[PDB]
Design a protein around this nucleic acid. Sequence first.
DNA 1: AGCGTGGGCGT
DNA 2: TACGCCCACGC
Length: 88
Amino acid sequence: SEKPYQCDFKDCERRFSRSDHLKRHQRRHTGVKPFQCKTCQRKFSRSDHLKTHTRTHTGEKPFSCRWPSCQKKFARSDELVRHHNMHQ
DNA sequence: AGCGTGGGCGT
DNA sequence: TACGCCCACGC
Ligand SMILES: [Zn+2]
Ligand SMILES: [Zn+2]
Ligand SMILES: [Zn+2]
């Protein structure tokens, strides 16, 4: 409920609860990409986004569709959420 | 459909 | 701070 870390970049009103969350957000302004994929050498701003990117090189799809006669696999949870909502 | 990526909130 | 997971938007 309290977010004292405010971004003072031009025309930005973002506020955050912790210093790292501010630093993470500020990477969208600066374009800094500290993390690099060891397979394709592409650089990314965040490590968690790098992790899911690597699954494009391995084909790993940990999230499976729970419909018995389907069972499509997906790399990220949000891909499975959209798929499950589609079966409706 | 597949995925970059910005944000919420956690350990 | 490191590290991560989920959710959602926009290609
Ligand atoms: Zn900002
Ligand atoms: Zn890569
Ligand atoms: Zn399915």
